[PDB]
């Protein structure tokens, strides 16, 4: 496929890694009664590994000559779920946090001693501000046009 990588559903090294992980987990199973709680816990780990490898196969990831998934970042439309969509979600959460912080810093600026609301937080004011980050892109854009975003010094 891309960059000489093969899909993990085809590559034999991926299946060999899955087999060796299960074999490593099953060696400790021999030291316990088949009905004991540690035997029940290692079986849950075996099912978790099987589900992990099956999911990595189904999602359509590319694996190298080592049997390990490799991420594709350049912008390929069939690999947006590895960098692009998570990156957009991160950029939405981080902008939310930054905008709520900026609004709280602006709201307490015009007081007698505004350094006391920075060590003892006015929780009701923060509760008011917090849910304004859900529409942070719109407001951040709109103070860009008017000129309330950047201080012109």
């Amino acid at each position: 496929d891309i960059s000489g990588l093969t899909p993990c559903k085809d590559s034999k090294q991926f299946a060999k890694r899955e087999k060796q992980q299960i074999k490593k987990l099953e060696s400790s199973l021999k030291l316990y009664a088949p009905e004991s709680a540690p035997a029940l816990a290692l079986n849950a780990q075996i099912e978790k590994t099987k589900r992990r490898f099956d999911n990595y196969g189904k999602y359509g990831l590319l694996c190298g000559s080592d049997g390990l998934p490799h991420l594709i970042v350049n912008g390929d439309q069939r690999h947006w779920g590895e960098f692009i969509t998570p990156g957009i979600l991160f950029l939405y959460i981080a902008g939310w946090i930054g905008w709520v912080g900026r609004s709280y810093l602006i709201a307490i600026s015009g007081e007698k001693k505004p350094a006391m609301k920075e060590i003892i937080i006015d929780v009701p004011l923060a509760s008011r501000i917090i849910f304004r980050g859900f529409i942070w892109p719109v407001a951040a854009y709109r103070e860009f046009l008017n000129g309330d975003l950047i201080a012109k010094d």
Binding site: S36, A37, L40, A41
Partner: peptide
Amino acid sequence: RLATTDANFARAYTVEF
């Protein structure tokens, strides 16, 4: 002994079980 150690271990795995 086996029962009391098994219960002690499964106390941390009740929810998963």
